RNA sequence: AUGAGGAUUACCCAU
RNA sequence: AUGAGGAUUACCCAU
RNA sequence: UGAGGAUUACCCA
RNA sequence: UGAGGAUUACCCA
């Protein structure tokens, strides 16, 4: 097919949506970033790699800059101060067939549906309670 | 008034919904398990830790399981034929808003939407190309 | 430009036909894997490096599986009976033009042609006569 | 029956056609070369054993020379400048039938295909990329 | 949808122009190389590597190659006489935006443009005076 | 013909162009700096050398400042947040003429040219993909 | 703390 | 990391 | 190097 | 066994 295209990362409607384009190829290790300085920034890296005899795996990766005072194009330091990194690693058997694997990432969208849980504490900056 | 409640992991049109529900909250870690043995359930845990001075760090883990039944000693057991592993980490530094928070979440969520790179190079077994 | 895509590596028709998509390129080694459980799935690596000062040297291989279940416990799993294995190596000098390799290339075409002594002999079980 | 015959290692329409003819066939290994200085014509060997109680074992092996004259004190011979290497190692288990067979060569075929990664890669002096 | 293709290096009306194509990008080196033996090839390659915690690096080298024909053992070769080399490191902060770039990229045209005292020296064998 | 003249690094079509001009030439170092605070300036220096029996060797090195939020004539920290360094390092045979190094310049010249791959991915805090 | 480190998975490994 | 350090050139050298 | 083996980018002489 | 080398049915770990 070829799957490495830009998207929209995040979505406020047409406007103000974030796209996120391919920027990096290097090592199969696949690179999307947002039109911005580096550091500020919206990045998207993913990668597949067989992690063992009977598993696959999956290692995806997101940086989300922080927005409110933020200066566009200027220099923020701590740059620890100023962004937010996820990290998302997902572990396949060798035995899942496409559906098992349509099934996984249904649960992943699952998690993260708007109005659950898991996003709504984050969204809140709480925890579980 | 609690945030820690059910939630339906796997949508397939309110007919196969894998649901799943609070099940322990002991040791600060948050756990849901569907209405399943404990050897063949969907498993979501998620606990929230002050990792640095200014950062803040969420671990969230999914565990998907194929169910399946199995002939130890002449005798059948409900079991899991293998299980799918997501483990997610999340650090997001004191100095976000609740805005720059809802950020996150909307890039967690277009990362994973339908037809996206990344949840059509999984469910199709591949990688990005 | 990329050459690092998909193909058709059994052509059956237009039906039947086994795809093999990219899936890893990391250390300088190209792999494509086909659809489904990768424990059932085609798969073809590729790589080149200088050999020596003078030569270049490609490693080709190729895995074409048996596809079969396998039950154990009452549990079947897909997997593969076994697996044919194709390696090859191409040594090809610094002094090859790209008409002496469109000509290497012609040879390895031909060597494999369907009716000739090669191809004939593996695809009846047998050797030279 | 005698599948030991010449055929055409190289098609270059009708006119420029690499014939390879029957040389040797001793101790288990089958010889072709082109005809003409046995300095400048291609070779193309092949043998099978069992190289273990499940496998059988191909091994190919093809040199493509180009072609040149060598003066040396005035004394011009037909030789070789250089030549190209192919080695294959074809594994195949006892319990492949014909059609597994067949389905083996098919892939063999389908790897080199005109305009697929491989046979572009070498064809232009490249790589995977 | 790719920035990886060929492009023509030196530029002579369209009539004796090198140009140059994507050959290799294996270990995160983009490749490019011209349509010549690999023994006197023009070659281009470029990685990008985040040098610093701050700071990303640019590694880009040139190979322009003075083609000739060597009579080696009295049999003729395509060699090169000899090869000069180009090879640049830019450094840019993260802090730097696609417009901070535009801005550096101008700055290296501007330094080689026909008539400017750089070019001027190398092209006349000469230092600045 | 005395190549030490001043020239425009920036060409932004008569409007903003940034003119460098000499400012220094100890130990045959040259260099040019355009109107401003040495830590906001573009500097360019360049030399020549006999690196070794048979090879000469230009050194060239450009600093660019980071425009985007910057203050004109203020103290800007850390030095390296706020600029772009670009060294290039160019060895020429001793066999090269006027010729041959007319071409080593168009290379230069078109690898950087407009819309070719390098400049493009520069331009984008990109790399290749 | 970091790892496109591993797992039988709230554990283990390396620097 | 730095070098107006070297190269047969994605390598090597010094601090 | 190998008409060396394989559990196929691993291991043997 | 080897994305080990070759002067290609040879040789190295």
Redesign the interface.
């Known amino acids: 097919?070829?799957?490495?295209?830009q998207?929209?990362?995040?979505?406020?409607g047409g406007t103000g949506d974030?796209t996120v384009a391919?920027?990096?190829?290097?090592?199969?290790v696949?690179?999307?970033?947002s039109?911005?300085?580096?550091?500020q920034?919206?990045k998207?890296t993913?990668?597949?790699?067989?992690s063992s005899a009977?598993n696959?795996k999956?290692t995806?990766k997101?940086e989300?800059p922080?927005?409110?005072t933020q200066?566009?194009?200027?220099?923020?330091?701590p740059?620890?101060?100023?962004?937010?990194?996820?990290?998302?690693?997902?572990?396949?058997?060798?035995?899942?067939?496409?559906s098992?694997?349509?099934?996984?990432?249904?649960?992943?969208?699952?998690?993260?549906?708007?109005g659950?849980?898991?996003?709504?504490?984050?969204?809140?900056?709480?925890?579980?309670?």
Do not use: H
């Open positions: 097919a070829s799957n490495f295209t998207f929209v990362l995040v979505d406020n974030v391919p920027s990096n190829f290097a090592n199969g696949a690179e999307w970033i039109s911005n300085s580096r550091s920034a919206y998207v993913c990668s597949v790699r067989q009977q696959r999956y995806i997101v989300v922080k927005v409110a200066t566009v194009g200027g220099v923020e330091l740059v620890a101060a100023w962004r937010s990194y996820l990290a998302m690693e997902l572990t396949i058997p060798i035995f899942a067939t496409n098992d694997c349509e099934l996984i990432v249904k649960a992943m969208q699952g998690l993260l549906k708007d659950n849980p898991i996003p709504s504490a984050i969204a809140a900056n709480s925890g579980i309670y």
